[model samples]
Target: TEVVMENVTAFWEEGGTPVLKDINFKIERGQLLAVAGSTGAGKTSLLMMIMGELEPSEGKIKHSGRISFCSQFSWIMPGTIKENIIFGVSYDEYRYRSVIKACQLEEDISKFAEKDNIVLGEGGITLSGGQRARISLARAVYKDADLYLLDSPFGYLDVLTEKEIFESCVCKLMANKTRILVTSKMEHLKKADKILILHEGSSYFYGTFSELQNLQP
Candidate 1:
């Protein structure tokens, strides 16, 4: 579904002022919108507002579609990788194989002593950061939401792995879907159909990468 934030203003419960104010933007289906900013620049707040996870202090948000969010920290339940991917939904063998393959987790899955039923140990201690992220991503893909919101999903990886994951996994899953990503890096900003920069609770700039680069600090 499409998402539109109109004149939205949001603030944390603490004594600080608004984190995002008078923010307006429209995200159409099948496009990638990148939110770039330094730490404490309200990137996560904006994502929360868009996902309807938090209500805006002032203005309204219009959204029409199923939504799924992938956070920076992976939340892995104590279960097999397959179960983690499928969550509580009834099993579908075809989709199970497809998602696992797409995530490039087939090799990893095979190494498990019990294959699809291997325990994740306590709190997913058996998986690496990239694996956890991929599993979380697979869960999102499995949900097949109209809008996908990811917060610094690639933060745990090195440059090469980050590029591979984006190219092999993220790019494939997000095709023909609306995605909002929050990250501080500029390496993949070129792939963003629209980019917004937030600073000091306001939109410092909003446009394509080219346009944003032209703005002075």
Candidate 2:
């Protein structure tokens, strides 16, 4: 397993209310686990614990692998498109090239007067919401880490763009890593290898997508 959280619980406020309870899961490589929950259900909080940014108040969290994260709000430095995508990583032309295609950046780049060489205006502040998100995904995917914790990677994407990324970059291309995607999209939940349902910071359900369907019908 890449990551295993057994009976884990977390509380943001020390000596206050707990945010998660009895969360349990095992993340094996090549598995896609989509986390689903309503607002304040602690989905992002759960991811934070896995990210090592938050300490669990109870239970055990174990993992032996590198992690790449794509936050809900993306970050882009005041640099060229290529610079942002490469982000100091040794450039692999093939990998970089494929990412551009997979992310459907052809049209976006065409609009950029200098294409990949165009620098952003003070941290890509001029980029459209979806462009920022795609750049974030591209950067994370380029890292090619062992585990990926994606927080609403599709939040800013439209329907078509979302589908393309899921099929090309996420599922087919990066199918080797363990992915825990925190999203509210039901479509992603349907496509996920496993679905984790959270309710009031509790593990409401954990199993395959088929099993989750069975719960309803």
Candidate 3:
């Protein structure tokens, strides 16, 4: 297993309410686990705990792999768009092109005068919310990490576009990597290898998508 959490619980402060309670799951390498919950359900906190940024107040979490995260709000630095997407990774023409295509960034790039080389931030071209989110996702996908933690990366994307990217990028491009995506969209959850439903900082359901459907119906 790439990550295993057994009865894990956590809190933001030393003497405060727990943000996560009795969470448990085992994710194998190359598995896709989609976390679903309403607002304030401690979904992001669970990802934080897995990322080791938050200490578990009780139980244990075993994680064995490098991680790359794409937050809900994308970060666009003051540099060329290519610089932002590739970050610091050495550019590979083939891989770079593929990533751009997978993220459906071709049309966006074409709209810009300088394409991917266009400077962004501080007197640079302004990008739409969806563009920023996709750029951020592209960066994370470009990284050569084993575990990917995506926190609502598609929040700004349209439904169809979101599904397209999920299929091409998450399912196909990163097929062999362990991934944890925190998303509320039921359609996305339906495509996940496993679905984790959180409620009030606790796991409401944990199993395959089929299992979840069976439980509901």
Candidate 4:
């Protein structure tokens, strides 16, 4: 298993109400686990815990291998588009171009006068929400990691755009890596190897799509 959590409980504040309670699940290598739940159900918190950004007040959380996270809110620094994707890592033009294509950013970049050289912060050009989110996703995908935690990175994108990116980047490009996507998109959930449903800050269910239907019936 790439990740495993046992009876995990966590809180935003010390000694405060738990944000997550008794969360237990396991993810195998190269598998995609879709996290489904309503707002305020601690979805992002669960990813944060997996990233070790939030410590669990109790229970055990275990993860093996490097992790890359594309947060719900995109982060764009005061630099060129190239700088954002490479992000101080070794740059391979071949791999870089592939990532751009997989993310469907080639056309977006072509629209800019300066193309990949356009500045992103301060007096620089302002990109739309979708642009920022794609750049954020591009950054994560460029990095070499065993596990990826995507927190609705395509929230700003349209259904078709999101589907294309998910297929090319998440399904194809990152096929060999473990992925955990927090999304309410029902169609996407159907493609997941496993599904984790959270409710009231607890894991309501964890299984396959067909298994989930069993609960309803």
Give the winner by lDDT: 4
Cα deviation of 173, candidate 2, in Å: 1.5
Model 1 lDDT on a 0 to 1 scale: 0.78
The lDDT ranking, best first, is 4, 3, 2, 1
For candidate 2, lDDT tens digit of each residue in 1-217?
7778898988899987789999998877788889988888998898888878889878999876788888888878878888888888899889888888888876798886788898865654388888888888888878867888888876578888798788888787887778988876777888887788899999888887788677795
Give all candidate RMSDs, comma-separated. Answer: 2.4, 1.7, 1.1, 1.4
Q: What order do candidates take by TM-score, descending?
A: 3, 4, 2, 1
- Is candidate 1 or 4 superior in TM-score? 4
Worst 10 residues of 3 by lDDT: 208-217
What's the distance in Å from true for residue 67, model 3? Answer: 0.6
RMSD of 2: 1.7
Score residue 109 of candidate 2 by CA lDDT: 88
TM-score of each: 0.87, 0.93, 0.96, 0.94
List the lowest-lDDT window of 10 residues for candidate 1: 118-127
Candidate 1 wrongly placed segments (more than 4 Å):
123-125, 213-217
lDDT (10s digit) by residue, model 3, range 1-217:
9888899989998998888999989889999989989888998888888787899989989887789999988889899878988999999988888889999988889887788888988675888899999999999999888899999898688899999999999888888899999887777788788888899999999888788678776
Clashes of each: 0, 0, 0, 0
lDDT of 4: 0.90
lDDT per residue as tens, model 4, 111-160? 98998898887676888899999999999999988999999889689999
